[PDB]
Amino acid sequence: TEDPLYWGIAAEAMTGSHLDEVKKMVAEYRKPVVKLGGETLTISQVAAISARGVTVELSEAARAGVKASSDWVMDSMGGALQKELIRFLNAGIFGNGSDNTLPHSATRAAMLVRINTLLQGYSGIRFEILEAITKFLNQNITPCLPLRGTITDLVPLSYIAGLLTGRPNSKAVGPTGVILSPEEAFKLAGVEGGFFELQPKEGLALVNGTAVGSGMASMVLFEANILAVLAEVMSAIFAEVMQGKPEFTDHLTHKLKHHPGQIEAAAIMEHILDGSAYVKAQDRYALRTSPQWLGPQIEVIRSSTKMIEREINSVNDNPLIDVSRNKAIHGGNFQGTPIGVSMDNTRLAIAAIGKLMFAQFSELVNDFYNNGLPSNLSGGRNPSLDYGFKGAEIAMASYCSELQFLANPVTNHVQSAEQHNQDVNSLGLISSRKTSEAVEILKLMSTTFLVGLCQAIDLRHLEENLKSTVKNTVSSVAKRVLTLHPSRFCEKDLLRVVDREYIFAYIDDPCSATYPLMQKLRQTLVEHALKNGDNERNLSTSIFQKIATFEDELKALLPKEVESARAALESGNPAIPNRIEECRSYPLYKFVRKELGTEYLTGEKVTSPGEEFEKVFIAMSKGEIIDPLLESLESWNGAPLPIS
Amino acid sequence: EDPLYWGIAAEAMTGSHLDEVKKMVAEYRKPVVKLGGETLTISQVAAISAGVTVELSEAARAGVKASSDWVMDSMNKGGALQKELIRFLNAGIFGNGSDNTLPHSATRAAMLVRINTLLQGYSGIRFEILEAITKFLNQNITPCLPLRGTITDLVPLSYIAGLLTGRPNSKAVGPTGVILSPEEAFKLAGVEGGFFELQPKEGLALVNGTAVGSGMASMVLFEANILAVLAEVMSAIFAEVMQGKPEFTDHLTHKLKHHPGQIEAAAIMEHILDGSAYVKAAQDRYALRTSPQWLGPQIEVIRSSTKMIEREINSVNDNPLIDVSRNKAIHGGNFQGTPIGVSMDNTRLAIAAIGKLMFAQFSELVNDFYNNGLPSNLSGGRNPSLDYGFKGAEIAMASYCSELQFLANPVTNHVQSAEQHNQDVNSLGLISSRKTSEAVEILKLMSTTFLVGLCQAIDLRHLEENLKSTVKNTVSSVAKRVLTRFCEKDLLRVVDREYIFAYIDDPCSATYPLMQKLRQTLVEHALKNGDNERNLSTSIFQKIATFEDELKALLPKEVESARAALESGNPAIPNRIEECRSYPLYKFVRKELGTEYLTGEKVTSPGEEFEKVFIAMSKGEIIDPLLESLESWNGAPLPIS
Amino acid sequence: EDPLYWGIAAEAMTGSHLDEVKKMVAEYRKPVVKLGGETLTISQVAAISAGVTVELSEAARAGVKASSDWVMDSMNKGGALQKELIRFLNAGIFGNGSDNTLPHSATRAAMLVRINTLLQGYSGIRFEILEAITKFLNQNITPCLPLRGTITDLVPLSYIAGLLTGRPNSKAVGPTGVILSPEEAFKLAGVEGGFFELQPKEGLALVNGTAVGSGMASMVLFEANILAVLAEVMSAIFAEVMQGKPEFTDHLTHKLKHHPGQIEAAAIMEHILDGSAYVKAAQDRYALRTSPQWLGPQIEVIRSSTKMIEREINSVNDNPLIDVSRNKAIHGGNFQGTPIGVSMDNTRLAIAAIGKLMFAQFSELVNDFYNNGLPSNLSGGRNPSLDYGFKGAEIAMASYCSELQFLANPVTNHVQSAEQHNQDVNSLGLISSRKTSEAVEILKLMSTTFLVGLCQAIDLRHLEENLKSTVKNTVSSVAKRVLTRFCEKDLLRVVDREYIFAYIDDPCSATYPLMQKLRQTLVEHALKNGDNERNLSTSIFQKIATFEDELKALLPKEVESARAALESGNPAIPNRIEECRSYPLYKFVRKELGTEYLTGEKVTSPGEEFEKVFIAMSKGEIIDPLLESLESWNGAPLPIS
């Protein structure tokens, strides 16, 4: 049972983890065949069709219902009206070039949704027309649709109808970008019957509906679901390289707020950190409150996904042909409010994920906040000639600012339209387009951040190795200069100085008298001299008399030693292996560093940060980040660590 | 099978929205709000904010004492620090007057949520302090909190702690509005033992939390839920008086989209229309025909936002947590009020969409091009030249809608990196709750105006049916008398088809459609009358002048007699609203509140009648007639027939 | 008397706006843009961005050399540092394709402003570098810059410097679109001597500045200024075809508010209407009657924004400045592009207001309730059931207006504290310029659609006057023939008063108003005809059937003959647009572009005709007919008469 208003079935689709939903979406996306029957279309199938060998097939089980309502319209009744309908809706503007044309991917999404939302049998259109649109998809012959003109999608959908009917102004684009007439398009696509002459109701069936707004919203939500998981995992890698306290993911904290999005985000981060070799070694809000921040954004993206998946399996033309009751049912299912509402809400959530990413990036490159990493994550021997990610950090502010502007809603700008017949209207596709632009900016930020984290990973590797070399050298010199002499007792304290000091505060000039290493090593020898008692009053047992000798020997030896150790690390033979290799997050570093050839950035080379960003951004846009992202979590059993 | 609690979250969304609202109203009216840290509802927050009594569950006392003792024992293993904490957080500004002070209702909401989110036993504060705040609630002694100063709620919450510690600048307001010193507030509340001296963690436990933002979000969502049901029912009443075709609510249409908000909205409207005397007696524009599609998603958003806030008001949101079971303090981020900021921005957008639909429907209703025979402006008097009806209210409705669309913009995209960049993300929850609260008040202005408009339209349909019956009787009598014949049925067809408010203010005017079309009917009959027309005794054309003279002599006095009889409570035909499922709302507005039919023949202005409904609405008096209009609904759509 | 330069700023605002636009158009069309650091106009930026040649003023060479030498001499009192600067600022992302690349036109605009803001001699960069960028402009070799990455323009400007230094990732696009390496770009441009090796301050001089944001703001403002004049003139053409009362432009009304934008707007519209054959042959709703009040402030904002940007494109905006006269470098903040962010946010709001007025006027024009006899949807064909005219375009106009209102939101209220909090305020100028550019494109979509709509309406008035003359001639002839008498003048009064598009598609239909009201006229005359009516030979009523049979036999063929004669270029009455001051715009759209009258009797869609005007508009071909329509105006309002 008894679920008469369908709240219960809706609620059941919101059970289980978000991650498991994303895993399912990815497996669906990679299937070779999209089979349409009017009721099983997912956003991942829309995304598959809009991107790339994937083919569409129509279920033969749907044919009888489609033929029933098509036959009914013909029996309930020359063609001039459907010809006029398409003519006057062809009111869009293309101009020259592509700036005012709906993108290729989005047109294919619209075509797929358009077919699926006519298969239920209530629309009164011939199955043969659905088969023609299916051929246009499978042969990658794409009608040209205007970008604007809809308040949600009569005007843009009429250019699909105009191709099917061979209007003289109709155009399509071939697989390689050639502009085609409708005759050429039919022949390349395998539509052999000549142009369609629209029967009554068929024009309305084609142009009435929300397929353009809901098709682009599907593409948007497929990417937004994956980027949410990427933001969760990158929060954990950020925590790793920042050396943050992992207790911020403790399950008790998140259990006590009940919010499931927050509980999952914390458990995912806790999984990354529980298998981290960096943790085996308070924080500011962008680290410590990242699960609280991300949780509601994930819940909104997930709810929005469910709204759009219902919309792309709905019957949204008018009137409906009800052969069972022998009548047409007039209504308003063309009103695309689920699209506008879900896209406005999702856009605000994307902006919040981007704002967190900006704040995390900002902590990461700031030497006041990043626990010993170099300012700007600079990588070369000479900080005066390496400003690291400073330009990228400026770019990240520009991304975040424009993202916050894009977060404003579209659906509060409704005009009373069409001689005030359409005195409310959804603006669904306009909102989908703005959320799509927001997703692209989030990809720019995710790319820049991810390359930043890999730089930070390599800097921690450099840090561990150079610190070991400084310790060894200080120990060598201390043994040589202070040995039996009362000065052999402060070797352990000299080493504690090295363990306590930040390598990157001095390693570019380790023996400079104005840097903390030499100063604090001298301070330690002075402190031991002051506690040396009467032994200090003898020039043979004086620690103070050893200072100048100690500093000369360190100056003669430490720079060459640091440089040898660094040359060795740059040749792939470090004394201490890179700890990322033993971390659960390794797949993402390995993909970025090895598979894509992204380079450690240093002012000693000519390579700019953007040249490396390009490699990650292009891979990200092809979905190549999906596999290493999921691989970092593949040993997670879907539960938080016990707190009892 | 539910380790991340998605499953229990989903189960909260399985009933109908109406059943949730019914349950909320029942809870709101209970005399006692018992707090245990786990069962707080927006209904209980709304009840405290608006002789309800608060009681603390004794089952919480043990856990609360454990963490309190734990903190004190970990000291010997703090006093000046907690005094300083409250001092430097007292950084708000009140000025003179009330414009920069948090409202009385919102402060009580905040205090109640503050108690509840400390009862789980993880906050390390003495139970005695919770009992003192409970006394301030039950005696209606309310500390003065600044309106602004929080990015979500250290600064405002420190003025609660300042009362409890007796800071010299602390002030409270008693039940009748008198300003009290902390000493006077303690005495009136019955709080014995003198001012509290905060133990370690106690200052933090009081100021660290989202209680101000979430308390106000609870008040806002209680009203949003009820106003959403009002919008669904008013959409059906609108359809009733517009003579809309009820087909737009047919369950097949909405079933085929699967959206549950839309299916419920349509089923509620279908229920109203299915028991409507107007429908039983008998395309449309989008604000009528697409109203289920339009409201559906807004209801889903408001419902989902409600669940988020109900989780937040039962959360532990201070820091650090005291886990006695593991002998440690757990540092974390639970003070980050993101669920408040997100749900309030989303709800405010949904509120703006409900108002835009209301504006569109009101605009159709007052426009004689669109309202199927109703007078322009819903003018009510005999003389349309001296009665512009709702024209002023329609301009006001546009101003309400415009400002509501402005308020729909989000707050949470304006985050500053704050507190020496330590708070480099922050939720802005209370700021968002305050903007959504303003949006709700504007929606009540619009709902008040629209609802009085609907009752005017109901009365105009009762006037229309009565005067139509009088015109038909007089035309019929004159026809039998002066036409000795087959033209009478056509003449009566003219009366049935013509809009009576197109002529009834001067029914025998030669430039109005009744006289013109009656004459056209006689002329067409004369033209098809053949050779018998060429005989003066059998000429239809030679009857026209007598017919028109007879009608002019009789029809205006009969119409005026009928109209005056209806204004005195003696209509020839009773008001059909009385047999409609929507009758409780009309009865409440018109008969219980005494809201009057608006007419230019009287001095009363539309705003005088709006006041009655607005004041009633703000005291929750609309709830009962609203729910009564749906009480026979079984919660399912009608079978598809 | 002007030590802070307010006075010279004010003097720039003293002429009329139209004279400024005229001057801008003249400048835009000059063959040479000579740069001297002081005279750059938005017209010159727009010309370079869209065989114009750039030349550098030799008078700047001395000052430029002085600061260049000064920097080199202060070194011996830098190479690796300037190489690093360009490397780390190359932090943008292009991906594949063009979506993340700054447009070709905007890049050329940026390069031109970059040269100009270095010619004052305070930037310490070699003149030779400025000459190289000039070669890239004059040979149309254009470096590839990222679209995003600036808060205003280090990152994008570093890709200009990267071309000049030959960085390995640098790319440029040649005149035909070929991607070039820096070596290939130097050869095609004729830049000899090899890649530049930046001296100290030279890397900073290139990347430190507001040239990308201000260059694009100049392009945007050039179009905004022209579109503002188009909106004023289209408001008058709208008034012409609506048969609006020209009183709304009376100078007393606008003089009494003192706002100069409104006074000019009204005077321009009054000038069009004063030379209108439609007006000479012969209240309104707000989009007509308040259009001067509505446009006035938008023009003032666009004008003031133009002056701000023209100052910015002639400013020195790098840092530090080299003041050889005082032997020192002056550190400061001139890279802060606040004038760009502020003027672009303000202009974008004003653009949205112009579009909202355009949408309101278009909505009146296609609505037969409001457009004073024009067909619903401006349908053009014989059969209204098979011709829905501009209904699709009207829905599109709503989508344009909605998105424009979204874009009206500001960018500059979203400032992040950036660059390790060193840039804790930043202008966001280029981001704002890009949003205002998008708003301008949408306004061109709306202006194209509205203007083709206006020409359709013009042609419908020409059809209406001709068919009205034919109906009057046929009714008059039939009347003289069958009525042997005084009724003829009343019968002709019916034709003069009735809207011909209410019946002309089937003029003898008994359910259309022409036949109905002609019959009513005869019946009223028969009724006042007295005893002579009672005689069959002198009965007006006995003439009706003959009259109607005669009219039915003759009127449809005469109407069709008249209509076909008009479609062949042989109207009985010529199109009155030909005697109107607005004729250049109609002649350009209809005759020079071959935009066609839209009709459901033909296959052509409205978008096919919009394309012609949109493409023409984007190439500046509307400018001449727009200005020609006002060429006889003396710049003053008409005397108050």
Q: Is C319 annotated as a binding residue?
A: yes
Residue keyed to tokens 């009928």: B562
Q: A506 with A517: CB under 8 angstroms?
A: yes
Chain C residues inside the 8 Å CB shell of B413: 414
CA distance A259 to chain B (A): 7
Handedness of CA C493, C499, C501, C502 (dihedral sign): negative
Q: Dihedral, CA atoms, B494, B499, B502, B504, nearest 10 degrees? A: 80
Q: Closest chain B residue to A290 measured between Cα atoms?
A: B333
Chain C residues inside the 8 Å CB shell of B409: 409
3-state secondary structure A491-506: HHHHHHHHHHCCHHHC
DSSP state of C596: -
CA distance A314 to A483: 86
Contacts (Cβ under 8 Å, ≥6 apart) of C591? none
CATH 1.10.274.20 fits B464-575, yes or no: yes
Minimal CA–CA distance to C501: which of C604, C393, C368, C619? Answer: C368
CA distance A490 to chain C (A): 39
Contacts (Cβ under 8 Å, ≥6 apart) of B637? A4, A5, B251, B254, B255, B263, B266, B267, B270
Q: How far apart are the first and last CA of chain A?
A: 36
Element (H, E) at A437: helix A428-482
Minimal CA–CA distance to C541: which of C526, C556, C531? Answer: C526
Q: Closest chain C residue to B425 measured between Cα atoms?
A: C416
CA distance C546 to chain A (A): 36
Nearest CB to A88: which of C376, C606, C615? C606
Q: C565 with C346: CB under 8 angstroms?
A: no
Contacts (Cβ under 8 Å, ≥6 apart) of A73? A124, A199, A200, A201, A321
Minimal CA–CA distance to B87: which of B162, B142, B150, B160? Answer: B162
Nearest CB to C149: which of A90, A167, A398? A398
Q: Is C371 annotated as a binding residue?
A: no
CA distance C543 to C533: 11
**Beta-carbon separation of C401 and A408 below 8 A:** no
Chain A residues inside the 8 Å CB shell of C393: 91
Phi-psi sector, A197: left (phi>0), alpha (psi -120 to 50), beta:
beta
DSSP state of A533: G
Chain C residues inside the 8 Å CB shell of B534: 536, 542
Q: Closest chain A residue to B330 measured between Cα atoms?
A: A247
Peptide bond into B320 cis (omega under 30): yes
Q: B40 with B116: CB under 8 angstroms?
A: yes
Name the packing angle between helices B104-116 and B127-138 (round to 10°). 150
Hey, what are A230's tokens?
Answer: 């990427």
Residue keyed to tokens 């359809």: B239
**Beta-carbon separation of A358 and C423 below 8 A:** no
Chain A residues inside the 8 Å CB shell of B368: none
Element (H, E) at C529: none
Contacts (Cβ under 8 Å, ≥6 apart) of C481? C550
The fold for domain A211-462+579-644 equals Fumarase C; Chain A, domain 2 (1.20.200)
CA distance A640 to A268: 8
Say how many residues make up chain A. Answer: 644
CA distance B290 to chain A (A): 5
CA distance B382 to chain C (A): 25
Q: Is B391 annotated as a binding residue?
A: yes
Q: How was this structure determined?
A: X-ray
Q: C43 with C126: CB under 8 angstroms?
A: no
CA distance C213 to C312: 10
**Beta-carbon separation of C388 and A614 below 8 A:** no
**Beta-carbon separation of A401 and C88 below 8 A:** no
Give me the DSSP letters along A94-119: --SSSTTB--HHHHHHHHHHHHHTTT
Four-way CATH pick for C211-463+576-641: 1.20.200.10, 1.20.58.100, 1.10.240.10, 3.30.70.141: 1.20.200.10
Give me the DSSP letters along B355-367: HHHHHHHHHHHH-
Distances (CA, A) of B159 to A400, B142, B166, B207: 35, 11, 10, 9
CA distance C273 to C629: 11
Contacts (Cβ under 8 Å, ≥6 apart) of A166? A182, A183, A186, A195
Residue keyed to tokens 């000049």: C164
Q: Give the domain ranges of chain B.
A: 1-210, 211-463+576-641, 464-575
Hey, what are A380's tokens?
Answer: 């070369």
Chain C residues inside the 8 Å CB shell of B513: none
Distances (CA, A) of A370 to A244, A293, A375, B29: 9, 20, 9, 54
Q: Is B283 annotated as a binding residue?
A: yes
CA distance C357 to C371: 16
CA distance C294 to chain B (A): 18
Q: Closest chain C residue to B537 measured between Cα atoms?
A: C534
CA distance C30 to C43: 10
CATH class of this structure's domain A463-578: mainly alpha
Peptide bond into A319 cis (omega under 30): yes
Hey, what are A523's tokens?
Answer: 């301070």
CA distance B273 to B293: 17
CA distance C353 to chain B (A): 15
Chain C residues inside the 8 Å CB shell of A400: 416
Distances (CA, A) of C43 to B506, C24, C109: 65, 5, 11
CA distance B529 to B541: 10
Name B146's bridge partners: B101
Distances (CA, A) of C253 to C295, C300, C361: 15, 19, 21
Q: Closest chain B residue to A359 measured between Cα atoms?
A: B424
Nearest CB to A248: which of B314, B316, B333? B333
Tell me the count of B-C CB pairs closer than 8 A: 30
Nearest CB to A405: which of C154, C414, C445? C414
Four-way CATH pick for A1-210: 3.90.1300.10, 3.50.50.60, 3.30.70.2390, 1.10.275.10: 1.10.275.10
Segments of A183-226 assigned E as strands: none
Segments of C147-227 assigned E as strands: 172-173, 179-180
Q: C332 with C319: CB under 8 angstroms?
A: yes
**Beta-carbon separation of B409 and C409 below 8 A:** yes
**Residue B325 CB neighbours (<10 A):** 9
Phi, psi (degrees; rounded to nearest 5) at A207: -95, -25
Q: What is the CA radius of gyration of chain A?
A: 32
**Beta-carbon separation of C544 and B536 below 8 A:** no
**Residue B458 CB neighbours (<10 A):** 25
Q: Is A232 annotated as a binding residue?
A: no
CA distance A73 to chain C (A): 20
**Beta-carbon separation of B545 and C534 below 8 A:** no
Resolution value in angstroms: 1.9
Peptide bond into C320 cis (omega under 30): yes
CA distance A221 to C439: 27
**Beta-carbon separation of A422 and C168 below 8 A:** no
Q: Is A390 annotated as a binding residue?
A: yes
Contacts (Cβ under 8 Å, ≥6 apart) of C186? C166, C194, C195
**Residue C347 CB neighbours (<10 A):** 27
Nearest CB to A401: which of C409, C416, C445? C416
Nearest CB to B523: which of C519, C534, C542? C519
Phi, psi (degrees; rounded to nearest 5) at B144: -85, 115
Neighbours of chain C (3+ CB pairs under 8 A): A, B
Hey, what are C343's tokens?
Answer: 């003027």
Q: Is A333 annotated as a binding residue?
A: no
Residue keyed to tokens 């919101």: A14
At C631, which amino acid appears? E
